[model samples]
Target: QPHIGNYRLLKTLGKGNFAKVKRARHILTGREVAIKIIDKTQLNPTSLQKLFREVRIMKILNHPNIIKLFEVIETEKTLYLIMEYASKGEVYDYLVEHGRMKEKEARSKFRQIVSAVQYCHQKRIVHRDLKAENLLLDADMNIKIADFGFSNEFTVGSPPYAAPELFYDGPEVDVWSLGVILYTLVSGSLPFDGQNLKELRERVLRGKYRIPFYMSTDCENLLKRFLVLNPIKRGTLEQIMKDRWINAGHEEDELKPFVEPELDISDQKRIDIMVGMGYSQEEIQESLSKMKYDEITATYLLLGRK
Candidate 1:
C-alpha cells in the first residue's frame, strides 16, 4: 500500500467493519508499529471526526497500560494511525481457560489494568467497548488497551458490556464494561450468556450471576455492588477502583516466578482425570503449548449449573 503521508503499511494484522489494523514499519525511525487504517467511505464526516478525536485523546495519554499512538494521516479517502503494538494477545481467553485465579495473583494483574483505565476516565476518555478481547498483554504480563473506534471523549455508549439503564449512552456505561472485565477475571465465565441478542439483553437486565464462593470475600463484595442491575446505580470508576478488593489489601508478587511460573493445561488434564474426561496425547500437548495461567484453570470451572 502507498504511504499514507509519511507512514507506510507493511502488512495486515487484523480487519473489521470500519478499519483494518496493519503492521507498519516507521519510515525514518524504522520501528515496527501497528497502524489502524480507516476507510472514510464507511463513515460520514461526523463519525470520521469522532475517530480523529480518538487519536487526539491517545496523543495526550501516557500510561504503562495505555497503547501509544505515534501519528495520524488523513488522505483523500482513508485515515491511517500509527501506534505501538502489544505482542501478547487476547487476555480474555487467557482468563477463561484458566479457572478461579489465585486471589493475590489475579489482583496483581487486574490492578495494573484498572489503573490505566482509571487514568483514561480521569482524562474524560471513555472506552465504550471493553473486554478481555480488548486487553493486550505483553510477554511480561504488562497490559495495553486497544480498540478506539467505540471510544468517546465526553459522551457515553457501552454496547458490548453496558448495563440496562446505562443503555442511554453516557459515561456511566464504561463502568459496566469494566465490571464485566473484572467479572471475567474472577468467574472465568461470562456473568450472563444467551443464544441471541434479545436473550443476552434479557440476561444482562435481570439474569442471576455471582462470583464463586471460593473467591476471597473482599473480591466478591466488590463485584456484587459494582456490576449493578441498574445502570444509574453503578458506581463510578473511582468508586470501583477504590474498593478494598480492587486495591487488594492482600500482598503478592507483581510477577510471581518459578512457584507460580504459570498454571497450565496439565492442571486441566489432572482435573479431567478426576472428572473422567479424556484427552489424547497430541491433544494434550498442542493445548498445553497455547495454554496460559488462566485458560488452563478456567477449564476446571463449570460454565454454568447444568
Candidate 2:
C-alpha cells in the first residue's frame, strides 16, 4: 500500500537492471503516467549521478522528438522519474522486423532522426547510443529517443558506431554510429561489416561505400561526410541540417555544396611519371580514362573544365 510521493502504482510497464517502470496514476491530477523506479542496491554514487544526469539531460532537451520528463524523486531505497507515456512502443522493433524502408518512409524517418540528434548536439549533448531500439513512437506517430540508458555526455558513441582512427576516446565517434544507423535504416544492412573488430575498423578507415543507384549523389555525399574519420572535418549537426535530403523541396542554396577533388596532373606529366617507371602509353591512357566522363555540356565545356 506504499505510495511513491503522489503517484499510486497501478501496474508495471517494464523493468531493467535495478529499475522497474510502471503505469501509475497521479493522485491529484488523476492522469496516467510512466514511473521509473530504481531499487536501493543500484543507488551508488555513480548510479545516483547518472540518474541526476539523465534528469538534467531530459529537462534541457526540449525537442519535440525527445521524450518529456514530468518529475523526479529520490528515496533511500528507490528513485522515481516520471515521463510522458509512449503508447505506440518501440521503433526498434519496427526496424528489426521491417529491415529496409521504402525511400519515402526512410527519408521521413531519417529526417526526424537528424532533427532530434541536431537538437541534442546544439546543447553539446552526444547521444552515445542511437539505434532503432532507442526510438519510441508517440500517439501522434512521432518518434522520440527513449533509452538514455547507455547515453553519455561523451563526444562519440561506443565501438561499431565509433569513427576510424579514434586511436583514443573522443566525440567524433558518435557521428560514426549515426552513420551506421542511417545505413541500416536505408539499406537494411551495416555499411562496414567485417569478420572481426580489426577488419571492421580497417574497412571504416578506408571509407568503403557501395552506393546503390537509387540512392542520390547528394545523399551519398552526405554519408561520405558523416563517415569522415577526422574529427576536425567531421560534420556538425548544423551541417546535417543543410543536407539535400533533409531540406528537400527547399531552395537550391539549401543543398550542401559538393567539392570534388581535382586530378590535374598533366597527361604528359602522368605519362612521364608512368613511362619513367617502365609503363606503356596504353597503360597510361587507361589510367587517364578512369577520370573521363562521356557527357559534357557545350556551355560548361566552353566556360571551363568541370
Candidate 3:
C-alpha cells in the first residue's frame, strides 16, 4: 500500500498551484481526513514562509465553525497537511444549487461564519479571504471556514470581495468580505462591478451598491453598515453580530452578483476548450453559473450530455 504517512489515499478531492487534496483513511483509527499534498519544488523562500505561516495559523485556531487541522507530514519532495474533512463542501455550492437563500437561513449561516472570524481576530489572526467559497458545511449544515493558503497578516481576498484599505487594513478587511457575502446572499449578484478594471475599482472604492427591495429595512441597513467605503467606518464583527437583521427574522432574495468579464487566460482556455467541443459561450456561461462558476462542474455537465 502506498501510504503518505499512516494513511492510505482514497482519491483526490481538489487541486491548486502545486497542491492536491486527497481523501485518506487513517490506518490505525480508520478515520477519514483531507490531506493536502503540496510540492516542495514550488516553494521559494517567501512561499515557504507563507506555507509555514498557514500551518502555524491552523494549529493555533480552534473553533466549532472553523475547519480543524490534525497534523502535518513532510517528505523529501512533498508536504502533507492532514485536516478535518468537510463532507458537504463549500457554502457557495448550496447557493448555486438553490439560486439564493432564505433570509433566516442566510442569517443563521452568516452568524456562524462571523463567530469563526471573530475567534480568529481574537487570536490576533486574520482570514484575509472570507467568502462563501471558502466556507464549508458539515453534515450538520454548520459552517466550517477552510483554505488558509492565502491567509496572513497582509494581502487578502479576490478584488470583488476585497475591502478598500486592504493593503494597510487589519481584521476589518474580513468584516467587509463578510458584508459582501451577505449582500451576495440577498441579491444574488456582486455589488460593485464595471465594464473594466478602472471602473470596477472606482465603484468598489465608492461602495456604490444597491440593496434589493425584497429585503427588509434591517437587511438593507446591515448592507449599508458593512459596505462603508471607509474601513474605520465599516462595522466590526461585534457590530455585525449585533445587527437587527442578523439577529431578527428577515426575508431572502435571489443572488445577482454581476458576472464580470472573463479576463483570465486559464478561464479563457476552459471556454475555448468548451467551444472546441461544440458548446457556445452562452451555453458555457449558463453551465458555469449554475455550477457556482466551477469549471469542473461545468465540464461534467457538458460531458454528462444532460
Clashes within 3 Å, all models in order: 11, 5, 9
Instruction: Give the runs in model 3 whose Cα sits over 4 Å from its true position.
Output: 149-156, 194-196, 249-306
List RMSD in Å for every model shown. Answer: 16.3, 24.7, 16.5
Which digits, one per residue and each the tens of the lDDT, describe model 3 over residues 147-230?
Answer: 643443222156778886762548878788888888877767778777887787888888878867778788888888788877
My TM-score estimates for the predictions, one after another, are: 0.70, 0.67, 0.73
Ranking by TM-score: 3, 1, 2
Q: Let me know the TM-score candidate 3 reaches against the reference structure.
A: 0.73
The superposed Cα distance between candidate 3 and the true structure at residue 154, in angstroms, equals 14
* TM-score, candidate number 2: 0.67
Instruction: Give the Å shift of residue 40 in candidate 3.
Output: 2.2
lDDT of each: 0.61, 0.61, 0.69
For model 2, how does the per-residue alpha-carbon lDDT over 167-193 read when each residue is reduced to its tens digit? 333446556667776776677777886
Instruction: Give the C-alpha lDDT of model 1.
Output: 0.61
**Candidate 3, overall lDDT?**
0.69
